[PDB]
Amino acid sequence: GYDRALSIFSPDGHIFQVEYALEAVKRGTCAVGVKGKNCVVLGCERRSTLKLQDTRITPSKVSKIDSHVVLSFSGLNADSRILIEKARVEAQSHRLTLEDPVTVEYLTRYVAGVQQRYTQSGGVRPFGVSTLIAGFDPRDDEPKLYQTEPSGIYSSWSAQTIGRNSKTVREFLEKNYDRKEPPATVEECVKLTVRSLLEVVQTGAKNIEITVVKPDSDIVALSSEEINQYVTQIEQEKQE
Amino acid sequence: GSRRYDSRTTIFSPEGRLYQVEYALESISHAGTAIGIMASDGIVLAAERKVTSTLLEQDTSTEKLYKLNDKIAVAVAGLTADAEILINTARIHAQNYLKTYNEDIPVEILVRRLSDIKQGYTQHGGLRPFGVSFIYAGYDDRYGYQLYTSNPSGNYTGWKAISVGANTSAAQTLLQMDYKDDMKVDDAIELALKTLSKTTDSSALTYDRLEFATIRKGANDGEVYQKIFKPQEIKDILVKTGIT
Amino acid sequence: DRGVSTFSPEGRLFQVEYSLEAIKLGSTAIGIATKEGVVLGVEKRATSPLLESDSIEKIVEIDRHIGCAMSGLTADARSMIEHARTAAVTHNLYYDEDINVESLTQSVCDLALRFGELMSRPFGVALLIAGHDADDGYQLFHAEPSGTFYRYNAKAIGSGSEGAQAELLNEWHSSLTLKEAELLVLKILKQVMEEKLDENNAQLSCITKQDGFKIYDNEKTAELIKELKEKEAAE
Amino acid sequence: NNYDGDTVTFSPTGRLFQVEYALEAIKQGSVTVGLRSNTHAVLVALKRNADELSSYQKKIIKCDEHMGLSLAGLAPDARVLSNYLRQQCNYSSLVFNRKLAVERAGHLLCDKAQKNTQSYGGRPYGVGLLIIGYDKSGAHLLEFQPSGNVTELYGTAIGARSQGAKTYLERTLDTFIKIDGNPDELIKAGVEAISQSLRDESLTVDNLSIAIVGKDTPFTIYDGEAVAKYI
Amino acid sequence: TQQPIVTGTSVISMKYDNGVIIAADNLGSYGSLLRFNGVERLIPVGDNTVVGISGDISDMQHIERLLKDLVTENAYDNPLADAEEALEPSYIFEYLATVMYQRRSKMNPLWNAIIVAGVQSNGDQFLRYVNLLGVTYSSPTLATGFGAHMANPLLRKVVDRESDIPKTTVQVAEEAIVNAMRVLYYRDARSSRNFSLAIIDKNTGLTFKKNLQVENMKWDFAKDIKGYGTQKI
Amino acid sequence: MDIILGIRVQDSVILASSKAVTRGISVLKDSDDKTRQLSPHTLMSFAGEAGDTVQFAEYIQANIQLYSIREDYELSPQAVSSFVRQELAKSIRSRRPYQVNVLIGGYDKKKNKPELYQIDYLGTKVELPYGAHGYSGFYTFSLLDHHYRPDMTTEEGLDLLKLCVQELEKRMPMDFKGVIVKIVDKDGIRQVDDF
Amino acid sequence: TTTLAFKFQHGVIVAVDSRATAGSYISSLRMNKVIEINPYLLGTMSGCAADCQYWERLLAKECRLYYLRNGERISVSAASKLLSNMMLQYRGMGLSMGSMICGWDKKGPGLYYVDDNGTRLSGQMFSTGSGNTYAYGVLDSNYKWDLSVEDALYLGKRSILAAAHRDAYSGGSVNLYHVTEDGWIYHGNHDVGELFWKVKEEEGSFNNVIG
Amino acid sequence: QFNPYGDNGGTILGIAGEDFAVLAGDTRNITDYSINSRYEPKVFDCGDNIVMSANGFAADGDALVKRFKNSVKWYHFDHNDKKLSINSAARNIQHLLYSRRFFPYYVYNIIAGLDEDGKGAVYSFDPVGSYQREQCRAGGAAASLIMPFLDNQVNFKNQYEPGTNGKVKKPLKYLSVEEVIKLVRDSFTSATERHIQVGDGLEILIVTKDGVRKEFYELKRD
Amino acid sequence: SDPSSINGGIVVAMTGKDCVAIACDLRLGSQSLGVSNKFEKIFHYGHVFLGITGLATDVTTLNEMFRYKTNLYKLKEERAIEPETFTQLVSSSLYERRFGPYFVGPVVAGINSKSGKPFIAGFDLIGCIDEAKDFIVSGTASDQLFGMCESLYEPNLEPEDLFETISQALLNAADRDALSGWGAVVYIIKKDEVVKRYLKMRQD
Ligand SMILES: *[B]([O])([O])[C]([C][C]([C])[C])[N]C(=O)[C]([C]C1=[C][C]=[C][C]=[C]1)[N]C(=O)C1=[C]N=[C][C]=N1
Ligand SMILES: [Mg+2]
Numbered sequence A: 001g002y003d004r005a006l007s008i009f010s011p012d013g014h015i016f017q018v019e020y021a022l023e024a025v026k027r028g029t030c031a032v033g034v035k036g037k038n039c040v041v042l043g044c045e046r047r048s049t050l051k052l053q054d055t056r057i058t059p060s061k062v063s064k065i066d067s068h069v070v071l072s073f074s075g076l077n078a079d080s081r082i083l084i085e086k087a088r089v090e091a092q093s094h095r096l097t098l099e100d101p102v103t104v105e106y107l108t109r110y111v112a113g114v115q116q117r118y119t120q121s122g123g124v125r126p127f128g129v130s131t132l133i134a135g136f137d138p139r140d141d142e143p144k145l146y147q148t149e150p151s152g153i154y155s156s157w158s159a160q161t162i163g164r165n166s167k168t169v170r171e172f173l174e175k176n177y178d179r180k181e182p183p184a185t186v187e188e189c190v191k192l193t194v195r196s197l198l199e200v201v202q203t204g205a206k207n208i209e210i211t212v213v214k215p216d217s218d219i220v221a222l223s224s225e226e227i228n229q230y231v232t233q234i235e236q237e238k239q240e
Numbered sequence B: 001g002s003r004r005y006d007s008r009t010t011i012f013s014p015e016g017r018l019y020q021v022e023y024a025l026e027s028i029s030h031a032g033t034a035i036g037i038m039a040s041d042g043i044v045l046a047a048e049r050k051v052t053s054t055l056l057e058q059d060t061s062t063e064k065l066y067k068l069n070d071k072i073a074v075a076v077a078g079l080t081a082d083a084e085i086l087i088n089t090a091r092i093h094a095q096n097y098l099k100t101y102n103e104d105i106p107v108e109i110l111v112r113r114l115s116d117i118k119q120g121y122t123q124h125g126g127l128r129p130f131g132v133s134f135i136y137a138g139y140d141d142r143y144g145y146q147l148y149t150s151n152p153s154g155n156y157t158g159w160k161a162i163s164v165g166a167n168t169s170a171a172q173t174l175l176q177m178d179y180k181d182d183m184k185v186d187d188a189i190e191l192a193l194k195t196l197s198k199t200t201d202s203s204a205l206t207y208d209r210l211e212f213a214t215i216r217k218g219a220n221d222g223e224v225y226q227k228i229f230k231p232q233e234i235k236d237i238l239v240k241t242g243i244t
Numbered sequence C: 001d002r003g004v005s006t007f008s009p010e011g012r013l014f015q016v017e018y019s020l021e022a023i024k025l026g027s028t029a030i031g032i033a034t035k036e037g038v039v040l041g042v043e044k045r046a047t048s049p050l051l052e053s054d055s056i057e058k059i060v061e062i063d064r065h066i067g068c069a070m071s072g073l074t075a076d077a078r079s080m081i082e083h084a085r086t087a088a089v090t091h092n093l094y095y096d097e098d099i100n101v102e103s104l105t106q107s108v109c110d111l112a113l114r115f116g117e118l119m120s121r122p123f124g125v126a127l128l129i130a131g132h133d134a135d136d137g138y139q140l141f142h143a144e145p146s147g148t149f150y151r152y153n154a155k156a157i158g159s160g161s162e163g164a165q166a167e168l169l170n171e172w173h174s175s176l177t178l179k180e181a182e183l184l185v186l187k188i189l190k191q192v193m194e195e196k197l198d199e200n201n202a203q204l205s206c207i208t209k210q211d212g213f214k215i216y217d218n219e220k221t222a223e224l225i226k227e228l229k230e231k232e233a234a235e
Numbered sequence D: 001n002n003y004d005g006d007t008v009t010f011s012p013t014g015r016l017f018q019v020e021y022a023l024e025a026i027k028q029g030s031v032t033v034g035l036r037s038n039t040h041a042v043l044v045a046l047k048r049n050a051d052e053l054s055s056y057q058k059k060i061i062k063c064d065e066h067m068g069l070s071l072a073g074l075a076p077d078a079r080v081l082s083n084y085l086r087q088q089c090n091y092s093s094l095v096f097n098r099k100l101a102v103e104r105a106g107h108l109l110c111d112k113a114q115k116n117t118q119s120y121g122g123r124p125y126g127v128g129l130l131i132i133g134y135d136k137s138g139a140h141l142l143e144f145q146p147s148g149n150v151t152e153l154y155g156t157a158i159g160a161r162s163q164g165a166k167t168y169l170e171r172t173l174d175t176f177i178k179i180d181g182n183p184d185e186l187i188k189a190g191v192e193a194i195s196q197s198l199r200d201e202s203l204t205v206d207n208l209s210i211a212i213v214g215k216d217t218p219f220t221i222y223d224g225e226a227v228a229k230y231i
Numbered sequence E: 001t002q003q004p005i006v007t008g009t010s011v012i013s014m015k016y017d018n019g020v021i022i023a024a025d026n027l028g029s030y031g032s033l034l035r036f037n038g039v040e041r042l043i044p045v046g047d048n049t050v051v052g053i054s055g056d057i058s059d060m061q062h063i064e065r066l067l068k069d070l071v072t073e074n075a076y077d078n079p080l081a082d083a084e085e086a087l088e089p090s091y092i093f094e095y096l097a098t099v100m101y102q103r104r105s106k107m108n109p110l111w112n113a114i115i116v117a118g119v120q121s122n123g124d125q126f127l128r129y130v131n132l133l134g135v136t137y138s139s140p141t142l143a144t145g146f147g148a149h150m151a152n153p154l155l156r157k158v159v160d161r162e163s164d165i166p167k168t169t170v171q172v173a174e175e176a177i178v179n180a181m182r183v184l185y186y187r188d189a190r191s192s193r194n195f196s197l198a199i200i201d202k203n204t205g206l207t208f209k210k211n212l213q214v215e216n217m218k219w220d221f222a223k224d225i226k227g228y229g230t231q232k233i
Numbered sequence F: 001m002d003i004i005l006g007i008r009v010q011d012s013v014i015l016a017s018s019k020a021v022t023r024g025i026s027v028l029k030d031s032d033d034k035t036r037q038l039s040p041h042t043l044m045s046f047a048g049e050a051g052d053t054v055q056f057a058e059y060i061q062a063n064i065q066l067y068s069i070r071e072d073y074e075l076s077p078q079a080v081s082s083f084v085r086q087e088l089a090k091s092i093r094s095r096r097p098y099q100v101n102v103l104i105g106g107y108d109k110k111k112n113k114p115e116l117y118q119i120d121y122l123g124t125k126v127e128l129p130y131g132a133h134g135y136s137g138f139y140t141f142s143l144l145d146h147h148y149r150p151d152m153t154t155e156e157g158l159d160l161l162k163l164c165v166q167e168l169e170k171r172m173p174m175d176f177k178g179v180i181v182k183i184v185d186k187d188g189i190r191q192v193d194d195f
Numbered sequence G: 001t002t003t004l005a006f007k008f009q010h011g012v013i014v015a016v017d018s019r020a021t022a023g024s025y026i027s028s029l030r031m032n033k034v035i036e037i038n039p040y041l042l043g044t045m046s047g048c049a050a051d052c053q054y055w056e057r058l059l060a061k062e063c064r065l066y067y068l069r070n071g072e073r074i075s076v077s078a079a080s081k082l083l084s085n086m087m088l089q090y091r092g093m094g095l096s097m098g099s100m101i102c103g104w105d106k107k108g109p110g111l112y113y114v115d116d117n118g119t120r121l122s123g124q125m126f127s128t129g130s131g132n133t134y135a136y137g138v139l140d141s142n143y144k145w146d147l148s149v150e151d152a153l154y155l156g157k158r159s160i161l162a163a164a165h166r167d168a169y170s171g172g173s174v175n176l177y178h179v180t181e182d183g184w185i186y187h188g189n190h191d192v193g194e195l196f197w198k199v200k201e202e203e204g205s206f207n208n209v210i211g
Numbered sequence H: 001q002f003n004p005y006g007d008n009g010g011t012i013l014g015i016a017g018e019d020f021a022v023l024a025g026d027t028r029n030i031t032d033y034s035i036n037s038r039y040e041p042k043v044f045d046c047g048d049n050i051v052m053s054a055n056g057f058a059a060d061g062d063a064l065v066k067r068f069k070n071s072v073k074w075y076h077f078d079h080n081d082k083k084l085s086i087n088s089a090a091r092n093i094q095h096l097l098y099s100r101r102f103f104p105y106y107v108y109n110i111i112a113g114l115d116e117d118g119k120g121a122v123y124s125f126d127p128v129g130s131y132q133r134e135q136c137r138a139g140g141a142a143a144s145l146i147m148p149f150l151d152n153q154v155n156f157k158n159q160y161e162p163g164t165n166g167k168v169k170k171p172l173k174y175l176s177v178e179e180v181i182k183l184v185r186d187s188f189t190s191a192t193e194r195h196i197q198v199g200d201g202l203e204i205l206i207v208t209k210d211g212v213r214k215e216f217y218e219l220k221r222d
Numbered sequence I: 001s002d003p004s005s006i007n008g009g010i011v012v013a014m015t016g017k018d019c020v021a022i023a024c025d026l027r028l029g030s031q032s033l034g035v036s037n038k039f040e041k042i043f044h045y046g047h048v049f050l051g052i053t054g055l056a057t058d059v060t061t062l063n064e065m066f067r068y069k070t071n072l073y074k075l076k077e078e079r080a081i082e083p084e085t086f087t088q089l090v091s092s093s094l095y096e097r098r099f100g101p102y103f104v105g106p107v108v109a110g111i112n113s114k115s116g117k118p119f120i121a122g123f124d125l126i127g128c129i130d131e132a133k134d135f136i137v138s139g140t141a142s143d144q145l146f147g148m149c150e151s152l153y154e155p156n157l158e159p160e161d162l163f164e165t166i167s168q169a170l171l172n173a174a175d176r177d178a179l180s181g182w183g184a185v186v187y188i189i190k191k192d193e194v195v196k197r198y199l200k201m202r203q204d
């Protein structure tokens, strides 16, 4: 078999293949995650260079791993399918062997472990993908939001963004998001998520996707018109 | 040892691109243009054969349009030999699904499976990727008529109208201009041929330089029919639309 | 290119030496061993204020009598911890007893040089393994990706290591109490850290014979930080 | 230069640079001395510390009741090779009810190290070993190099500044060989030999490591206050 | 799993003051057919060990080759192959015992019963038994098959316990062995008159006697035996 | 285990399964639910060798739940039954076959029809209006052959099911400790708590 | 062998005998048929002693690893399932094990029956071994959810006694356990010989026996 | 058909004192109605103040002991010459036996020594690996003959105090090494009389904090 | 116990003048118990017809297998498979399981689309081809079918006459078999039209 060590250390102590995988993430479309008091919202950019697209059948950016956990990403699209598939298999495997659904922290730890394994295994390259994993643990009303990256490190976030121009939207979130008082309702949480994407997106038409996840496996994706109403209200307040 | 001669086909550039995928796409940009257009009552697949000869046996020839099953077909752009490897795998996958569930495979599931195979060659194994881009035209009872494309990266997307191969930039602009949502198959046939006629590198668009196919519910009652056009039938539709 | 297991003209493995450079870029971790217990402390180093700092887990339990702190590419440590926990519990299964801290450390270090063309590269993380057993008492080990491990009375690893090690050179003596060691880790962490040390961006832990391995609460550490400030202002 | 990228490549003068670079790792390692009489064989090792807070790296490893070695270079490679010896000593006992001859133990180490010098992908061992033992033909001392070369000697030394101890043993050859039935005097000669390789530092209680094997003496290692007698 | 085809019967042995004696007949039986009359079942290993084998002859010939190869292998890179690092009886036995137990553990045994007789470096007598099951035991007298039932009782009258060994001479021991072989010829239906005998002494070394015969047999009384009860003529 | 019955009526499928679990000569449990929900509109009851039953059922459940998440779509009862049959037909020529018989009751939301499939451990699939496994059919099929109509209501299906259970309770030598009854229709799966 | 376990208002009672037999020969008078997996988990043993000891001690390894990975105690439901899955790997290979996994977790008290076939059953009350029928007789007629800790301990003790008397392969002594939310509590070793005579006099039972 | 198992007879006996332990066993080795050896040692000093005897099928007994002795050697190598405690040795042996769950070592095994508090300890094993600590245990051919005697004379079973008539038991007073060795010798002398596989010789190994001592006694040779 | 007679069933095929006929019963049982009266044993892949008797799980499995293989054949060859070619495919497929066979008795029937020649064939469970001119029988009442076919059959029968002959052969053979019956189907096959008829028979 092909055993060639592709991810290796350089004289200055860097693994370039892992670092170049982060550059692939930088190229990817922007993704954002914001957790409110009783919910988590996942926002995703859709680049409008591609029109004549069939939005019914085109792979959506946010993927359900189980009925209570979702996963969005930034980077190589093809790579993300492999992580999602593995995550979905592990989710059913956990239910089968332990008789409880996975915690959001466990699922994140697994996906992060897969990414890490591909940084010190022969014949393979790292995943050019960073993920945002969100949801609610079984019989728990505390929101969960985690991030992973090609190196395999993961951590929990009150709010986080990844992908192209993520530096800008993170700047916005850092000054707008208050920890002592997070978005109390679904409206406030979605509004803040749309606002953050409007710093980067371009047009607020079909370029913004929003997915709300509430406790007890209550997951819904907002439509174009519902999002468009947020876009309208934000700019009308801005004209002042 | 052997390391000396390894090109390392599955690595990132400093900019975060996959070298071999990008170069495979460069190869595909020189291949004959293939166009797919989805309508409310069917799908059209049109494709241009590359600089042919008068001594080529056209009626028994197939380089662009292939049948995966009774409901799904593909248009090819790139290395034909590479495409046939993948096509036979896709045909088997469709039959595996049918044997397991006793239902015809949903279009997206087949597309995802092929796209995952392509992805694998970019991440592990040390082999060159498949220099092929597909346009999938298919039907199932969930989403109805569907158009997809896949490329050597293993990334796939859905479309109302799309082109692959040569002059896609020019072709996509022309499709974006004249396409409408309430369009029908007969209109889509005309759009596909008109687009090829303007984007072609050849002097004139003739029947012997084309492969053509439709997927219609224009089959007797609730069912779907695949029509791979014969040379004489391509010649007739060229006269009908007013190109020759 | 060149082999992964290649020797340099000086007689060192290139890849092992390069992994050591990655460890120098990691966040600081300090360990101090006393006769009342071993203290482990780390710099969390959150990249952003929105990152919930309590999710940063750079101090980890291996067994009830063994703890572990890390520095460098921390993602690499997860499989090492998994092996360590398995080794510790497996020995308890085979021998109905706790495993020696040295024997545990040796088992972890056996993974280190299992790389070639097995895993494709050495680990990019160093570990401070602290624990207690009946034979050798309270112990602190430093486990490198070279497969080598040294026992230490006190040790610092990470970006502020050589500055912290010089400070540990002067401060450590064989009669240190646990409380004195706690304040000493906090003192040296505060010295080498970029940001101002508090209960949210730094973490303490210890291992004692009675209570075993314990990670300190943020409320408990906050009091030890306040106690440190007052005793430094006292002279 | 162009021929040191891997172990599978000869240079134009017929040299194997990766093996030579592995040999270099031994020279960087701390000094260790070996010597024997007709009744006993002794290992003496200068242990090295990282700093004042750190412990002193162990240099001597037991392989069987009648055999063991001291190391200089990459310690993990010594662990691998000593583990192999332990297994081979143990295979000889379990299958043949026979204590493994020291000469045969050397032949096995030679052949194990050699395979790593002729194949692609692997690397040579980065450690030198001094094996002592007492078998049916009396006391023995072996020197192992990771090139594969194993040599039976009356006495020797490897590591940094080992040339000083080796010259001393070359002068003392006729004296220490005759030290029969006196373990303490044989160790003294070893401690005096390793002293010729010291600079700046001297032999302290947690610095010195000694091992001995003989006629009615199982392989035993002395550390700590057990070697204060010889300081 | 197999069945033994061509077989060898009893192997008998005993310790005496300065060494050990071992003996076995020269027959290779094929069931009830006394097929092969020139089979050597005592196999010397060096000048200090004799391995006596009973049971399947094809497996015996296999063991004979293992021992021959063992000698060859011991000489490799061994300047003391004919001195301090020569093969000992205890080494040879433990090797065989390892092989026998491994083969039984794979359910494919060597269908044999083996006695290793010899003298060690320090002059100590070695006498130990091993069989197809990997079962091992040692005793002042040892015998396989029928020998266990008929020879041991006779030999144990000479050396009943460990303290009788120094009191037993080579002349007395050989006399007992030769008598035992005669008794086995009277009573074992798979035995032959021709046999081999080997003595391993710590002073005089290995003495290997071939083409021995059972002699001084009592048959004359057979003439007086008539019928099975009442018959007089 | 012992008893599993199934009946497809106008607008639903009803599955009845015994509650008993026996080990040696002792009845360990009299409230055992011999069924697993494969999807919101598909229920599978099972009976066969001890251990194998639950482990097979849960393995099928996991595969269907995985499919549902991957495609964000519920498989038709026909598709599920074919998948299950293939797994059993695969199993019968294995080193150690899974000795499990199943009934799959589902409501097809596309066709708006209830569907009942009977599959034995060999992988023998049949679509039926009513079915059973083991000896259950020997006692009950004569009643079902007589009383069954395809336009029956759910309440009429339950009454005919009660009659089948009464006949079993009279003529079977074994005490199966009653049955748990579940109904599968357009609104999903629910359990009849009083039977 | 007779083992039992039942849930009640104040947790779960666990009682076992201590006899081990090799044919008709009583090999052991005092065999420990309970395993302390953790301070909140117990496991009973019936069938092959070797199988019971090995696999339940291996369960304890796997339950301990769960705590280290998750920083939280394993549930009774999850522990019982790990054990049943082990049994399913050696499916038909001839293992003989009948065990009840008893404990307290976040759902409250938990009790699962698990055997060599891979069977895994949740329930309020179970009894395994050659004398389980005798134990069930006493349990079924005297069990209530509203039992006091003192009476519940006696019921389990008295139920084992009933089996030890009649079943030839049950006896020796009674080991009692009580599982609370603060962990399991050992309630001693009780010789059946002495316990029998005591119960006879105090309770008035076993009238047919002379003493 | 090939039968990989056999029966070499023999009987063993372990008794745990207050600060000592004994492991005894006869020296007779047999097959069917023949004697192989009148003196074939069966109880072994395995190191670390532990004694062991695997009774039953000799070939499996010799292999197990050999492996355990090997396990002690590697325990020293791997864990810095640490002493293997009797409880740790017992658990290790369980895993050695269960490694052949589907092709067992056909032996009843006993080990004896001192626990970590200095008190006498005996552990007993079945062929598949079930083990447990005991005060008293006879194993092998004549195990059923000896155990009842030890229940009576070591644990004072069915023995009450005169005058009380069954009300008060005989108190469980500890036994000295000299008293234990008497019970061992009388056990084997009685077993020799009524069991054909028991006889020839008796070898006893006594374990104290001072070390391992041996004692040998003749038995009837018929 | 005997896999070939657990579920029961029969298949018979006949040649006529420019036509073929293939018929089967509808019973599926579990030994004595009748389970289904709608278990059809005849399948078709284009214009080639395949009847399969024996173990029902293998009947279902093989149908799904030959559907799989004929669908790929058609995609590659760009034409429907012919009876002669399909017969070889059935034989190949069965013999590849020589030492772990499908417990079946297949029967092929059809008309070559090019030559127009009627074709029938029978197989044993492991692939041996019986290419008969007159008729082929299979199932638990194969002895009964042989007796009926051998007496009732005559060559060159017209489609509507052949229907009566094969129907009466099946019906009366099934009525002397406990494991066959519970309905019956007959396929009449011509070069470009196929008629399927369900027969009325006793339901015991
Ligand atoms: B009990 O009878 O189930 C008991 C439980 C075990 C944990 C000690 N088992 C045994 O007594 C078995 C025999 C048996 C008797 C009745 C039913 C089932 C099994 N004996 C052993 O497990 C055994 C093990 N080693 C030595 C002697 N006996
Ligand atoms: Mg006797």
Ligand SMILES: [Mg+2]
Binding pocket: I203, I204
């Ligand atoms: Mg009938």
